[PDB]
Amino acid sequence: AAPGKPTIAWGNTKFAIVEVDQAATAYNNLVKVKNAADVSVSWNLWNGDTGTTAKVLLNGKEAWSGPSTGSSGTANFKVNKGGRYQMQVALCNADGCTASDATEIVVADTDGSHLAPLKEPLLEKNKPYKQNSGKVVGSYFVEWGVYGRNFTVDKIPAQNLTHLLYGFIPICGGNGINDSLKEIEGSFQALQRSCQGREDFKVSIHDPFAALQKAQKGVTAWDDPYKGNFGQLMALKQAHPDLKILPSIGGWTLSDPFFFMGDKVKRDRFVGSVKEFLQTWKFFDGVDIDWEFPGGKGANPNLGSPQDGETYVLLMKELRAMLDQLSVETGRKYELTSAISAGKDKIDKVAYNVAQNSMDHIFLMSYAFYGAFDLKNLGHQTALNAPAWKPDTAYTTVNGVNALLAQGVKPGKIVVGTAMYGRGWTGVNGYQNNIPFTGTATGPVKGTWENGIVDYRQIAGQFMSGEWQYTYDATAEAPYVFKPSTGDLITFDDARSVQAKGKYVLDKQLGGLFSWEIDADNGDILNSMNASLGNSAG
Amino acid sequence: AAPGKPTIAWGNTKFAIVEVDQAATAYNNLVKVKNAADVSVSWNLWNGDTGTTAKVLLNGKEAWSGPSTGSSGTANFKVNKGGRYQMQVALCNADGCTASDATEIVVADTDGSHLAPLKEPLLEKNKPYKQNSGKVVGSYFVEWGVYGRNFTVDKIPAQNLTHLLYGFIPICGGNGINDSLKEIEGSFQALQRSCQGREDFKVSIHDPFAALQKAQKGVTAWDDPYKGNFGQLMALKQAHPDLKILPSIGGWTLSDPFFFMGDKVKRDRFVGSVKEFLQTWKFFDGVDIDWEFPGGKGANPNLGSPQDGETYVLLMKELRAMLDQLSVETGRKYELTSAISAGKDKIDKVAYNVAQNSMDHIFLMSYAFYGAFDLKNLGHQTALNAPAWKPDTAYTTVNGVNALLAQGVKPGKIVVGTAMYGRGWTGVNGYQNNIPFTGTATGPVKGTWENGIVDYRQIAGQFMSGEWQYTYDATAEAPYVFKPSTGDLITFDDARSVQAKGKYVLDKQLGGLFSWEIDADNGDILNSMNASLGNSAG
Ligand SMILES: CC(=O)N[C@@H]1[C@@H](O)[C@H](O[C@@H]2O[C@H](CO)[C@@H](O[C@@H]3O[C@H](CO)[C@@H](O[C@@H]4O[C@H](CO)[C@@H](O)[C@H](O)[C@H]4NC(C)=O)[C@H](O)[C@H]3NC(C)=O)[C@H](O)[C@H]2NC(C)=O)[C@@H](CO)O[C@H]1O
Ligand SMILES: CC(=O)N[C@@H]1[C@@H](O)[C@H](O[C@@H]2O[C@H](CO)[C@@H](O[C@@H]3O[C@H](CO)[C@@H](O[C@@H]4O[C@H](CO)[C@@H](O)[C@H](O)[C@H]4NC(C)=O)[C@H](O)[C@H]3NC(C)=O)[C@H](O)[C@H]2NC(C)=O)[C@@H](CO)O[C@H]1O
């Protein structure tokens, strides 16, 4: 007669292809990529003949087989594809095979194949849009926003985006390489801990706790291998297979390392580490380079060289070559983007007409044109055009787009920036004809998280009432609120200025719109980005 | 400044003092009693000075301490008491100690200290009673009832009992020692597998899957160490701290080994294994001996000796001595009981007037007086008295009680048996004056699970309607149903006969009532046991 029916032993059923060390703070030790997950299963036979061969099946297919030598057995084998499997133990003899009931086993991987789709309801004022315009609709999500700002991946209105960028992936390096981090308490040290034993110029993760270990919706079980932002992004990719999720390298305080990349030894090491990062974290779809900025004038006053433009063009061509190789290895399309200054003095330091051939999209940072960093020359921080009182204004969106077009950049590559936050000053005084922008300020406006910067949510929630004046400048295409008693002035984007940017993109055949930063919107800004580009509601 | 605040690493938080091998079918390998659980905790420090000393606290008390030498650490230590603890990791230096948030850890033990109370709602017709009569209200639960009968520990109306007996714990032994098991397919083999490598005459668990591994309400997590009947009984003891839960050794098919216990070498080995079993499974409160029966005439026709009475008295005295020692070692009260034949021919083979001094209670099996085992001499199987048509009837409850009293047994030791099932015959014919008990039968009645035996639930649900006659014999104090067309006759207890037994117990100052078997009642029988003994509703 056939063997008796085995009973699968109680035991762990959760396994991973990319293992995470739960007691590691250095990136080198934190993740281990294997070619396959090590899986184990045991069984007991409470009644009958134990058979002569025991097998482990996954969805009916043999993953292991060996001699059946007693009432209990154990099998160890490898599983090289992530997902959930119905696993059975079958005992066979010449008279037949008898299979156990199935037990589900989970085989984790960083594409999120083991995870349920994170498909959460839209919050605040976000309304549903269908990405059918063919235009980019992007936004940045910040790693550290999960703490005070309490804005996690399950709160991103993901169906309303084509591109979701993660700021920021740091480049390892200590003294003289990431000195701009020292301006932020504990930040430089944090990177040195993450990069312990790791060469400089290789990428890492700045805050491994936020990126991978903090419990978040959908990834709360103790043995869920990937938690934090990366575990939720993987689940988000299961929910939105076409959303492009790009890791952004750099930003204001993590850009110093780019200034050393004129040394091809360092550049090659960096590019190779980006390739490894994408092989490790499969939910990511390319790389965004946010170098602020070629030529200097970024956070570090001691960096910047006339050689930076060349280095930027080389870097893009080599990134593209690496991504093209990864692309054919995997059958996937990988994207290469960059967030750049929108000021013509900085644009002119790079030959974008050449670099564009390596890039899918150029995220023109048409924001922060003005702000509390300059208390004497006030102006709209993210306007489309110059204002009527100063038609010579250098820093406007159109001027940055025009600088790119004048180099020969194709219009379709250019993605216009929208601000989901305002910049502002306090004590504004000595202005003429009721236009506060003609005076000078005494300091920054009180921000939501930091001086001189205010979330759009707070502008709409608190500064559109009481003594606050509201004006929409139709020449510049920019809103601003002003409190005459304290002289507080805030410049930002609102639904109408975003609609003007969107119409401008469609008229000039530009690539779409992107924003900084997603946690600060209440929905009004992203709704307008979507509507103004022609995306159908629903 | 004090050290930074550590983050407890994700990891297993469930540990056990008595470990269970998930891939073991032999009792020797299945459970491992340790003096303490091996616990482990790891931690990372994402910000700050790591301190110079790291400590693991349980409810604020140090369980481990060692030098803090880096950003991550691991501690291994022992916990010798079951329960749930709030565990913290603190990093200290001369300037202060900084403790992590707490993480609960579970330390399992077999008293059920790690489990939530299994306090389930009464089902079917069971109504709530308060054990305030001072009388025993007992019932047996069968290990194998969790399969076809689907009657699990969460279905026991536990608040309505003083004593819950578990049938049955087997005594290891193969050929010539447990031959009565061979009458049940796979049963003898099952015991040989459980007892592999274990000496004969030591106790074991007959079906380890039902007793410890089958998922049941309250004990379904893969890493819950104790599942099955024993895990639920532990949780039941957390819910009913005063309920006495006794393991019963023997029964109809596991009694053969007792017949060899005239050899003190074997008897001592048995008693020592009972002590070990109670040290291992702390939720149990003593031991019930169900030897059927001293003198033979049990399942095995080749066993029985005139020496059995002596062996029984010795066994009880030695069990009592072992329990008295365990009792003072633990501060607990342990009970020693026995289920015995109620026929005077069998009672007379034992000097109960002597054995009673070692026993807390005598469970008089005043049932199975008659049944399909004898097709020619029909009669009430569990009546209080003889019927009017045969006032010389030997097997009645009163006669068994009277045999005990005549030896000198104290009335308070005697617990009267009630049947939660009926016995019956088919083809009953040749009876006079409409009393079916005067005829003879052609075979057994069709049972619920086995021939000639019917659950009371089924008697009430199916055989109290249609062609079935119902009669209550007030002389005997016994109900019976009869189907004249097929000649099917069933004898059992009902609420009224149980009330007569209960009044009899109170009148004669007996110890209380017990029943066989709890899964077969729909609530009517246990309700009456409780009411008739004077227990207040509620
Ligand atoms: C003496 C003084 O008055 N000098 C003035 C100049 O400083 C000034 O030009 C503006 O200069 C500031 C630097 O202080 C600069 O603002 C940095 O701007 C970048 C964007 O280009 C920001 O970075 C990106 O966006 C967010 C923030 O918006 C970053 O946090 C993120 O890392 C980056 N990524 C993305 C995708 O957004 C920096 O955050 C920001 N830093 C500070 C300190 O604010 C403006 O870009 C400069 N503007 C131009 C047009 O160059 C000049 C012009 O107003 O006036 C001089 O007087
Ligand atoms: C030739 C023939 O006709 N002989 C008749 C005799 O057999 C007979 O006496 C009765 O004999 C049967 C044995 O066949 C016996 O029934 C065994 O009874 C015990 C209880 O005493 C049962 O065991 C316990 O209870 C349940 C069952 O009710 C068990 O399953 C459990 O293991 C035990 N524990 C508890 C707590 O309950 C046996 O299950 C049962 N076995 C069978 C096969 O049914 C009766 O006890 C005998 N009665 C007396 C008074 O001795 C005799 C009397 O009717 O008639 C002869 O003719």
Coordinates of C-alpha atoms and ligand atoms in Angstrom, one line a residue, chain B residues 140 142 144 165 168 248 250-255 288 290 292-293 297-299 339-346 363 365-377 381 394-396 421 423 450 453 514-517, ligand 2:
Chain B
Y140 CA -13.7 12.4 31.4
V142 CA -10.9 11.5 25.6
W144 CA -9.1 10.9 20.5
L165 CA -10.0 13.7 33.8
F168 CA -5.8 8.1 28.7
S248 CA -6.1 9.0 33.8
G250 CA -5.5 2.9 31.8
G251 CA -9.1 2.4 30.6
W252 CA -10.4 -0.6 28.8
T253 CA -7.5 -1.0 26.3
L254 CA -4.5 0.4 28.1
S255 CA -4.9 -1.6 31.4
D288 CA -6.2 8.8 38.2
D290 CA -8.3 3.3 35.7
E292 CA -9.9 -2.5 34.4
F293 CA -9.7 -4.6 36.4
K297 CA -12.4 -9.9 33.1
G298 CA -11.2 -6.7 31.4
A299 CA -10.3 -6.6 27.7
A339 CA -12.1 4.6 38.4
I340 CA -13.3 1.1 39.5
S341 CA -15.8 -1.5 38.6
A342 CA -19.1 -1.1 40.3
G343 CA -20.0 -4.8 40.2
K344 CA -19.7 -6.5 43.7
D345 CA -17.9 -9.5 42.2
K346 CA -15.1 -7.2 41.2
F363 CA -14.9 7.0 40.8
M365 CA -18.2 3.2 37.3
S366 CA -21.9 2.6 37.9
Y367 CA -22.6 2.2 34.2
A368 CA -22.1 -0.5 31.6
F369 CA -24.0 -2.9 33.9
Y370 CA -25.6 -4.4 30.8
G371 CA -25.1 -3.8 27.1
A372 CA -24.6 -5.4 23.6
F373 CA -21.8 -7.4 25.1
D374 CA -24.6 -9.8 26.4
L375 CA -27.5 -10.3 24.0
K376 CA -29.4 -12.6 26.3
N377 CA -29.6 -10.9 29.7
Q381 CA -27.1 -0.2 32.1
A394 CA -27.1 -7.9 40.7
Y395 CA -25.7 -4.9 38.9
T396 CA -27.1 -1.7 40.1
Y421 CA -24.2 7.7 26.5
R423 CA -26.0 1.1 25.4
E450 CA -19.2 2.3 17.5
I453 CA -23.2 2.6 22.1
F514 CA -18.8 11.9 37.7
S515 CA -19.5 11.1 34.1
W516 CA -18.2 9.3 31.0
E517 CA -17.7 10.9 28.5
Ligands
LIG2 C1 -20.7 -13.9 28.1 C2 -21.3 -12.5 28.4 O1 -22.5 -12.3 28.1 N1 -20.8 -12.0 29.5 C3 -21.4 -10.8 30.2 C4 -20.3 -10.0 30.9 O2 -19.4 -9.4 29.9 C5 -21.0 -8.9 31.7 O3 -20.4 -7.8 32.4 C6 -20.1 -6.6 31.8 O4 -19.0 -7.0 31.0 C7 -18.6 -6.0 30.2 C8 -17.4 -6.5 29.4 O5 -17.7 -7.0 28.1 C9 -18.2 -4.7 31.0 O6 -18.2 -3.6 30.1 C10 -16.5 -3.0 30.1 O7 -17.0 -2.2 31.2 C11 -16.1 -1.2 31.6 C12 -16.5 -0.5 32.8 O8 -16.7 -1.3 34.0 C13 -15.9 -0.2 30.4 O9 -14.9 0.8 30.8 C14 -14.6 2.4 31.5 O10 -15.7 3.2 30.9 C15 -15.7 3.3 29.5 C16 -16.9 2.6 28.9 O11 -18.1 2.7 29.6 C17 -14.4 2.7 29.0 O12 -14.4 2.8 27.6 C18 -13.2 3.3 29.7 O13 -12.0 2.8 29.2 C19 -13.3 3.1 31.2 N2 -13.2 4.3 32.0 C20 -14.3 5.0 32.4 C21 -13.9 6.0 33.4 O14 -15.4 4.9 32.0 C22 -15.5 -0.9 29.1 O15 -15.5 0.0 28.1 C23 -16.5 -2.1 28.9 N3 -16.1 -2.8 27.6 C24 -17.1 -3.2 26.7 C25 -16.5 -4.2 25.7 O16 -18.1 -2.8 26.7 C26 -19.1 -4.4 32.2 O17 -18.4 -3.6 33.1 C27 -19.5 -5.6 32.9 N4 -20.5 -5.4 34.0 C28 -20.3 -5.8 35.2 C29 -21.3 -5.3 36.2 O18 -19.4 -6.5 35.5 C30 -22.1 -9.3 32.5 C31 -22.9 -8.2 33.2 O19 -23.8 -7.6 32.4 O20 -23.0 -10.1 31.8 C32 -22.3 -11.3 31.3 O21 -23.3 -12.1 30.7

